[PDB]
Amino acid sequence: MRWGYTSVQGFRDEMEDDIVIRSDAVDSFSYAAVFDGHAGSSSVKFLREELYKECVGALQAGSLLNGGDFAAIKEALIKAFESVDRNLLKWLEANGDEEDESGSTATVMIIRNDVSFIAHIGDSCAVLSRSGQIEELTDYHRPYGSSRAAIQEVKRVKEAGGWIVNGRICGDIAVSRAFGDIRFKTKKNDMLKKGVDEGRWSEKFVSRIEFKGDMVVATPDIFQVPLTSDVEFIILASDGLWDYMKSSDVVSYVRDQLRKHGNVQLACESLAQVALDRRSQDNISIIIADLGRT
Amino acid sequence: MRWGYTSVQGFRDEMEDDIVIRSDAVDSFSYAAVFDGHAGSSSVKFLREELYKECVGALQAGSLLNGGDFAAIKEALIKAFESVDRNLLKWLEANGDEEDESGSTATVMIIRNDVSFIAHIGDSCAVLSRSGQIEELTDYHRPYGSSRAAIQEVKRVKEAGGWIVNGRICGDIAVSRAFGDIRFKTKKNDMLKKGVDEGRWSEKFVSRIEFKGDMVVATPDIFQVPLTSDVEFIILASDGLWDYMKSSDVVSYVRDQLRKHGNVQLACESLAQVALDRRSQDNISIIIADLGRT
Ligand SMILES: [Mn+2]
Ligand SMILES: [Mn+2]
Ligand SMILES: [Mn+2]
Ligand SMILES: [Mn+2]
Structure with missing residues (x-):
């Protein structure tokens, strides 16, 4: 070839x-x-x-x-x-x-x-x-759509404690599997806190979040x-x-x-x-x- | 290609x-x-x-x-x-x-x-x-032969203090440049002692040897x-x-x-x-x- x-x-x-x-x-x-x-x-x-x-x-x-x-x-x-x-x-x-x-x-x-x-x-x-x-x-690997694959990604993201708005995880990323993206993995709690300091969310909003796993995976x-x-x-x-x-x-x-x-x-x-x-x-x-x- | x-x-x-x-x-x-x-x-x-x-x-x-x-x-x-x-x-x-x-x-x-x-x-x-x-x-890279390269290898091996018998440095190795061969590099004095213990050469013979560099090089x-x-x-x-x-x-x-x-x-x-x-x-x-x- x-x-x-x-x-x-x-x-x-x-x-x-x-x-x-x-x-x-x-x-x-x-x-x-x-x-x-x-x-x-x-x-x-x-x-x-x-x-x-x-x-x-x-x-x-x-x-x-x-x-x-x-x-x-x-x-x-x-x-x-x-x-x-x-x-x-x-x-x-x-x-x-x-x-x-x-x-x-x-x-x-x-x-x-x-x-x-x-x-x-x-x-x-x-x-x-x-x-x-x-x-x-x-x-x-998208956190939206109607395919079986899409439904499964959304399921996984939500089970991890993530949320999705406008096809984006935390209103941010529009792909659910990737290398890197540390703020959706090992630094996700820092992400939330940064969001509060930046005015993306309220302290009240982030205080209600509980993460159970990485939202984005490299699998x-x-x-x-x-x-x-x-x-x-x-x-x-x-x-x-x-x-x-x-x-x-x-x-x-x-x-x-x-x-x-x-x-x-x-x-x-x-x-x-x-x-x-x-x-x-x-x-x-x-x-x-x-x-x-x- | x-x-x-x-x-x-x-x-x-x-x-x-x-x-x-x-x-x-x-x-x-x-x-x-x-x-x-x-x-x-x-x-x-x-x-x-x-x-x-x-x-x-x-x-x-x-x-x-x-x-x-x-x-x-x-x-x-x-x-x-x-x-x-x-x-x-x-x-x-x-x-x-x-x-x-x-x-x-x-x-x-x-x-x-x-x-x-x-x-x-x-x-x-x-x-x-x-x-x-x-x-x-x-x-x-051989410590024998008539080529210009051969002459050069022999000269380097001798300057380092090595000797050559029948195409082989210390009667052992038949190439003058190679990877590994620690006994001709960092462990050469231990090589001499080993040869004495094993009957390969006399203590007198080795006492007169003075190594100035590695006999085999990887250059x-x-x-x-x-x-x-x-x-x-x-x-x-x-x-x-x-x-x-x-x-x-x-x-x-x-x-x-x-x-x-x-x-x-x-x-x-x-x-x-x-x-x-x-x-x-x-x-x-x-x-x-x-x-x-x-
Ligand atoms: Mn790109
Ligand atoms: Mn692209
Ligand atoms: Mn071989
Ligand atoms: Mn061979």
């Missing part, structure tokens, strides 16, 4: 997306990741190296990619995400500037040759084309995707694409580009420009795995 | 070679290494991630992040090797210890876009083909090679290949393989078989970078 990738600032005043594509030829695997940072870049910077190291370390301990055990691979990937977040929060606490209020979502794909695994938190999305037809692979959903001959390409992208283009349209567009010139990098660059043409207001990051089939 | 690799035990009763190939598509960077361990695998095991981590770190530190002059890259690679060795020596002592007399040679290729760097200690070898002709990229030679279109492929391999096949024959063989079927992995596998056919008695490891020219 071949990679196409692009990651551009677009119309935003800062670039907080990043992409990683790394391969181990000896162990026949690749790692691709889209990170969509928010409220600064410190979390993305941390992830850009730390997350690969931890995921690969976890998969190599016991040769998990080789022995075909999904449950074991899922366990390892979740543990890796959670470990990285714990270390990120420590880093944020020790290098804090507070607010360093940064965080990042993450959509990761590991491929080893016939199978791929997706590990996902947040609001980027991964999809594939199977015999011309789109299949969406990930679910958004990923893991998906197994066998790379059967009918799987033509896979796209990982940030919401700078998906918020501005229907996913079926994205897949059809990439299909057409590849038919036109067979060049996945060119296809990827063209797609990003189409997002901008459709007035995308966000950073845009896109990774396409062209599997050289159809 | 495409990678071919093979790493086989051959007729040895243990496998002490290893290979690493890691690529980063977004930064157009890759790292490839051949390690030939001796007297155990502990040094190779350490180097497998530790040398990579240190080299990648170094080449992204400070200004190097934007390229850098050759002198600065050379200094960074040398310091990285030397740092890794210091940490390896500490390690060998703190873990599992004695007699851990392990060590390892290392030949590393880093590709940063259109330029390659070779960083080398020991007696693996790297070569390239330019328009069908061989160019050797590395010198053997690499660094070479820069522009990756122009006439550079067809680059081969890194352990001496299990080179001791049994002329280097010009290796290059011709690989050229003929690629011309015939265009498959670098098959070329690599076939080459290793030729080494076995030529009565190689050692572990054999080979990495071929096929740069994809006509």
Whole structure:
């Protein structure tokens, strides 16, 4: 397979997306990741190296990619995400500037040759084309909406003692899973107190709050995707694409580009420009795995 | 570019070679290494991630992040090797210890876009083909031979107070640069005492020895090679290949393989078989970078 990738600032005043594509030829695997940072870049910077190291370390301990055990691979990937977040929060606490209020979502794909695994938190999305037809692979982690996934996130956020207004946890964050975001995790009580001093809430209001767990978590959903001959390409992208283009349209567009010139990098660059043409207001990051089939 | 690799035990009763190939598509960077361990695998095991981590770190530190002059890259690679060795020596002592007399040679290729760097200690070898002709990229670090490099190694080993018998420092080690080998570095006076206790040499003989520096060092030679279109492929391999096949024959063989079927992995596998056919008695490891020219 071949990679196409692009990651551009677009119309935003800062670039907080990043992409990683790394391969181990000896162990026949690749790692691709889209990170969509928010409220600064410190979390993305941390992830850009730390997350690969931890995921690969976890998969190599016991040769998990080789022995075909999904449950074991899922366990390892979740543990890796959670470990990285714990270390990120420590880093944020020790290098804090507070607010360093940064965080990042993450959509990761590991491929080893016939199978791929997706590990996902947040609001980027991964999809594939199977015999011309789109299949969406990930679910958004949003504290609103009508999907089963949405209902479950709202349930979790509320059980943690959080509240939601206008689709935002504590009227603040509109994604319910992410790396970083320490004020919704280990520093949530300080958050409340800061809110009182700032005039967001009343002392009376915050005195009534009881937290039982983190409102935002870094625990990923893991998906197994066998790379059967009918799987033509896979796209990982940030919401700078998906918020501005229907996913079926994205897949059809990439299909057409590849038919036109067979060049996945060119296809990827063209797609990003189409997002901008459709007035995308966000950073845009896109990774396409062209599997050289159809 | 495409990678071919093979790493086989051959007729040895243990496998002490290893290979690493890691690529980063977004930064157009890759790292490839051949390690030939001796007297155990502990040094190779350490180097497998530790040398990579240190080299990648170094080449992204400070200004190097934007390229850098050759002198600065050379200094960074040398310091990285030397740092890794210091940490390896500490390690060998703190873990599992004695007699851990392990060590390892290392030949590393880093590709940063259109330029390659070779960083080398020991007696693996790297070569390239330019328009069908061989160019050797590395010198053997052996305390024997007639080459200029050989003369230099012998001179350094003697200045440090070492002596050489039958191609071997203190009748023991047959390479003059390597990772690990603590008994030729920080524990050399203890080596002498040990030799006395074990009957290897007299107390009188050792009393006259005065060490001024390490006999074996981890300081690499660094070479820069522009990756122009006439550079067809680059081969890194352990001496299990080179001791049994002329280097010009290796290059011709690989050229003929690629011309015939265009498959670098098959070329690599076939080459290793030729080494076995030529009565190689050692572990054999080979990495071929096929740069994809006509
Ligand atoms: Mn963002
Ligand atoms: Mn975004
Ligand atoms: Mn060996
Ligand atoms: Mn050898």
